[PDB]
A paper describes a structure:
The nuclease domain of NS1 (NS1_Nuc) is responsible for DNA Ori binding and nicking that is critical for B19V viral DNA replication. NS1 contains one nuclease domain (Nuc, aa 1–176), one helicase domain (aa 302–457) and one transactivation domain (TAD, aa 523–531). NS1 belongs to the HUH-endonuclease superfamily and it shares conserved ssDNA cleavage mechanism with other HUH-endonuclease members. NS1_Nuc is of α/β fold in nature.
Totally, two NS1_Nuc structures (Form I and Form II) were solved. The Form I structure belongs to P41212 space group; and, it was refined to final Rwork and Rfree of 18.0 % and 22.2 %, respectively. Except the extra Gly residue at the N-terminus and His175 and Ala176 at the C-terminus, all other residues are well ordered in the structure. The most distinctive conformation was observed for the β2-β3linker in the Form I structure. The main chain of Glu77 forms one hydrogen bond (H-bond) interaction with Asn74. Compared to the Form II structure, Glu77 is shifted about 7.3 Å in the Form I structure.
Author numbering: 1 to 174
The structure:
Amino acid sequence: SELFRGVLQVSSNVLDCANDNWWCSLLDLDTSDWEPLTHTNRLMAIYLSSVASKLDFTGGPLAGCLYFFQVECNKFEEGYHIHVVIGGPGLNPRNLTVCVEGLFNNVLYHLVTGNVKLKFLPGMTTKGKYFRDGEQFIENYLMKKIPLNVVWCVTNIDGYIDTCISATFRRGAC
């Protein structure tokens, strides 16, 4: 496949501006092969789930796209960062950033107080082109993370729908 990849940063300002809608959102999350999700970790898992649900039924440039979203927090990291792997017939290097930002920010809009938005940074090659190695990046890198270093993961890609939130499979992949 030829999937793009990039990252959205989540500063601590985003979580500081989380509103009642976000803190009170009730959504089922399958943590039976995961660590318990509480506090702002659960908010990020809920958010990622909501973004995926929106994407599953969106038209326009994002129609029919394959995606893999993974929210992470490293040691000493404030906030979170979201790895995005995404591709489809309507997505191209000219519209990728606006389309991904619009998708994530349209969901975030109802969850934060104020004009708080995320930005998307595409991963770029040595020659300055957008990477199209997204599926290999999932296999080589993203799937080798274990919770709660990886906080949550959502995908519609065949090879990962059954392992994306399997701590057991992820542990064996490292």
